[PDB]
Structure formats: C-alpha cells, structure tokens
C-alpha cells in the first residue's frame, strides 16, 4: 500500500463510497471513527474495536500529551504498539481540548499555553502540534487551527479563520519538513468560516492552495442544531476538493451521519456512542433507547432486534439493563460495544447503498423508522 | 454426567488432585473459582473468565437478591442464562454479607431479618437462602449458617457452632424436599468451631451425620493470620469425610492456598484477584507488584515473564500502569484478566504436581522464589 490513495468507486448525488489506502491498512469511507482518549477505546480491547468494523480509530492529542505524554509514547514505540492498534490512527491537533478543558488558555499568533486540568504547563503550536503527532506515530495528522466558538461575529470569524489559514500553512511546512512523517503519514487541513459562506469560500480556497491529503469541515457539531448544520455543509462542502476525503470533525448521531453523507462527507468522528453507552443510551434501527428504564427490566430481547453485534447475539436488554443500574463494569463493555458495532452497521448500509445507487431510498428508509 | 461425583485421581500427603461431575461441566482440583458478585465477575465477559482456565464461578446470593432479585432472576430464565456463563456455579448463601454490609440485623434462632445498605427489608433463614440458591439455578448449593467472628470465646464459638449445625439440617431438609434442586443440584456443609479444635470435631461429626455432598470449612479468613489458619486446618480437614470435596471459604492469596492444598483442600474463592487488580495489584511468580508505581512507566515487560494470558501476550507493564493511573475502564479488564489467570496457571501447576508426586517440592520452589 501507498502513503496515501484515496478512490471514489461510486457516487449518488453528492455522496460518495470508496476507500483511502495507507501503509498501516484500507479505510472504506463512510468511515466511523471510533474515539481513543487517552491511548484505549473506552471499555474495549482493539481486538473488540476491530470487530465491531472499525478500519481506523481517532486518536486525542490534548490528553495524550497529558498523559502519559508524547515523548514517553515515542520512547516505548508509538501509540500503536503501546496500546496494541495496527491498524491507521487519526489524530486530532489538541487544540479544541485547550479550549474545553485547559485552565491557563494565554492565545497568540505563535499559539496556545496553558494549565493542565494538575495545573503543570503545557504549549501548543501548528509546529508543536505536527511534532506531537509525529512522536505518537499518528498516521493521519490534523492540521492545528484556532477554535471559532458558536456563535460568532462575522468579524471574529473571519480574523480567526485567517488565523487558522496561516496556522494550516505552518502545519503544512512542519509536516513536509520532518521526511519520515512526510513519507509515511497524511496530513489533513481543516475549513472554518463559521457559518459564513463567504468566509467558508475564502477558506476553502486557502486551504486548496496550500494542498493537503483531506479537508475537514471544522466548527460545526458545537451547538447550532441540525438545521443549521445541514445548510453550512450545503455550501461548505462542495467548496472543497472533489477528489480528497471530506471529514466533519465531531460528527454524530445516527440521523447527523445520514444527513452528512447526503451532503458529500466521508468520515466521521464522535464520542457519542461510546460515552452515551456508559451512559445508558443504546442506539436501534427504531431510535436510542435507555436501558436504564424499568421497563427493560424483563425484556429479554437484544439491545436491537437485527443487530450482528456479539452483545445482541448474547445477552438481554434485563441483563444490560442490571448491569448500568448496578454501575458494574461489564455493563460499559456491553453497551459501548453494541453502539460502536452499531455505527459500523450504519456505515455499511451507507456504502452499500451507495454503491447500489439506492442511497436516497436508504436515508428516507432510515429516518422513518429511527423516527417513527 | 451425573448429578454430582468426585473422583481423586491422585494424591499426596494430605493434597489431593482430581474432578467433580456435575450436569453442567467438570470441575479439576484443586479448584479456584472467581467471585461474581451480582451475576457478573467483575470486568470480563463470561467467555474471557472461562479461557482464563476456570471450570466454575461463585455468585453472591445476597448481592443477588438485593439487584436484581431472585425471583426475577428465576422468571430470566436462571443465573446462568441471565449472565452468559452454562459451566457450574456455586452461591454463597447470603449469610456473610448479611452480617459484613446490611443495616438492620435482627437476629433469631428463626434466622435473620435486615435493611439493604436502599434500606427495603429483607429476610434469609435456612429455608429462604435454599429457596433462593434454587431460584437463582444453583449448581452447588451452600447450607445457611451463622458467622462466628474471629476472635470468638469458647463459649460464643461453642452457641454459634451449634446453631449452624441445627441450620445445616434445616438446609439439607429444604434441599431434599425441593426435588427438582435434589435431583439436579449438590448441598455443601459447612464447619464451624472457631479456633477450638473440640468444636471443629463436633461440627465435623454433626456435618457428616446429616451427610453433604460436599464440606466447608468457615470460620477463616477473618483475621487470623496465616499461621494460626494454618494450625486451624492442620486438625480440622482430616475430621472431614476424605472422599468428599473440602472448600476453604474466602481464601486467600497463592501462598494461602498452596498451604491449604497442603493441609487438604479442595475448592478456593476470594476477591483477591479481582478486587485488588482494579486494584494495581498484579501477581507474578516472583510476588504481587503495583503496578501504579512510577518505576513501571517505561516497563515494556508484560505483568509477569512466564504467564501464558493474552494480556502478558499482547500489553506492556507501561501501558497498563498507565490505564490503571488514568483510572479507564481498560485497566480493570486487563489487570481483573491476568490475575484470574494467574490464579488459573498456579491451580493448574498445583494439580500436575500433585499428580506427578512432586507438589511438596513445587510448594518449596513456589515459596522460594514468590518471597524472594
Ligand atoms: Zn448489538
Ligand atoms: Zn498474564
């Protein structure tokens, strides 16, 4: 396999089904990328997260520097030996975490310094950033960019997608001059803009210039509703290039996916399904449910009635239903292995559908009966 | 296989290796079974605690009766479909707990009435905690008795004593009056006396008059040291019947049982490794180690050098030090894996050494190089 090849085997409408090659392993796309925090898919051995489908998992730059820190990672071999994934690893920039979690928070145009949420020092930098996914071994490297909040002023948006701009050069320059990241990983640029088609244009076009392996639609999934987020991508993501993945960074329940798709995008990331499963929340082809209501007690059908999951051939809602009531371990496991086996499951209904040219009839199909 | 039949294969000294029958499986020993507390042991799925090596698991009843509840267990289908294990279980009868975690305890030659630790009232007495382990689908079945506190006066050890064993009929006739559990399942006795080697003789000829499939010996595991339960066992296990299984209740560490192998016993439980990997305890034939301690951080070595488990297969001393400091949920699966593993390979070289002669020199090298 190549550094990098992204194909397109079909398309239907805007929607596209393919795969990207990397050294490390294929990526069909749509693709779901289950969340690691800090070095493990909460509650789930990477055997598990392989089986549930999963070609590839997103690593969390911010908490990994933390702990147990980049440089120790690159000294016992990488984040994929330490936690024992093979296959690719996305990583985010740290950046977005600074802004939720970090306490210090001093911004500039060389970058972000802050507090630790046990108060130790930290930097972050485009240049700081790229080093820290290189140490990790990460094979898909997020460009580092500045948080724009939701809302924000057109002026606001416009200074910091400036500034995101020349932090995506910076990346890009960092990334190309260290030759065993540039030969063997791929770097991804992310689009902001906020909600400003204009601004989305501008950065669009930045981004094209500089020239990166994918694009990410940043600075959505951050409180402005489906709606809104439905009509920025209607704009956004033709903006970028055809022929590259599009990301959408943070992205989301079940009918978010669907609706991104539709839209042009090609991979995904979120914590919801596995940190809804620990908690409660399980998804179904009729809609989540919440295995902590009573009346699960005695129900002794799968968590989803069609569900391939090893949870849904095993055990019982009333068994899964005990075991978050009674906060046992076990519990997690169950339910974050049945959400992200059923995300999988989503994403190959997708590209099959796809690929059989009957995409629209699958997300009509699907919203009338998650919605029903 | 029939209802119940235990077969020495070999022995040596006092030590005894060879099988219990039962409908749902075999069981070799000596045995170590892990605890499951309510219908789960603690972060493995039913199938990981099986490859571990164990033939059998033990199910707290009164964990079980609080949540979910025996009678809804029973209308699940039984414990064993409720939870995904169908190789034998063992339930406590609910006694210990009763006195160890509930509130009320009113106490009566009748049995015992008590608040849960959400304070709903409960009650258990020979003939409730049989009726429980019955609805519960128990396949060996623990006779309810009274805890002796350690340390006990004669006379108090002596009332208790007496008391357990006028409730040990109780059970065997609730047993044996139930024949669906008398035709399927099996009933243990269990010794008491304290340390008081007249009492442990009383209780002894008291059990084996009503007669039991198989024999505990309560009482230990309370704070007496290992010398002084050493000393306890050197007289109590030979008043037991020879050719039925002795069960040490609660115990205990590997240097624990393979004093006790010694002296005797059969069968062996304990939280221990469970409960102390959560809970950076790992065992190693070279001695538990914490794993949490800084000098593990860059430890690319697995948990222990020889151990065949598929956590010293697959994850470093570094990264579960590391999961385990973080406090996710990873870190319990593995540390909760290798350690009933552990457990697994020392029962395992227990019952080829006895087999083989030799057990007397393997406790010796065992000890020689566990507290080197
Ligand atoms: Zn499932
Ligand atoms: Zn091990």
Redesign the pocket.
Known sequence: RPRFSFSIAAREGKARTGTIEMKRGVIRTPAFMPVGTAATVKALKPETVRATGADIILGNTYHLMLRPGAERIAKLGGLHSFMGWDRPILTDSGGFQVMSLSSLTKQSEEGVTFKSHDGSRHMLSPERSIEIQHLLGSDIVMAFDEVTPYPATPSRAASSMERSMRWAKRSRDAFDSRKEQAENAALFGIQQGSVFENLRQQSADALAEIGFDGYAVGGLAGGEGQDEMFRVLDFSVPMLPDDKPHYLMGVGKPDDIVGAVERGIDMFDCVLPTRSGRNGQAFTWDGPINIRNARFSEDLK???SE??????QKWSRAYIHHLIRAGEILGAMLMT??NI??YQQLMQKIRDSISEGRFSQFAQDFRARYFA
Chains 1, 2 share one sequence.
Do not use: G, K, M, N
Request: aromatic share 8%; glycine share 0%; with cysteine.
């Open positions: 799968p968590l989803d569900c391939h999951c090893a949870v849904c292995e049945h086996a059923f």
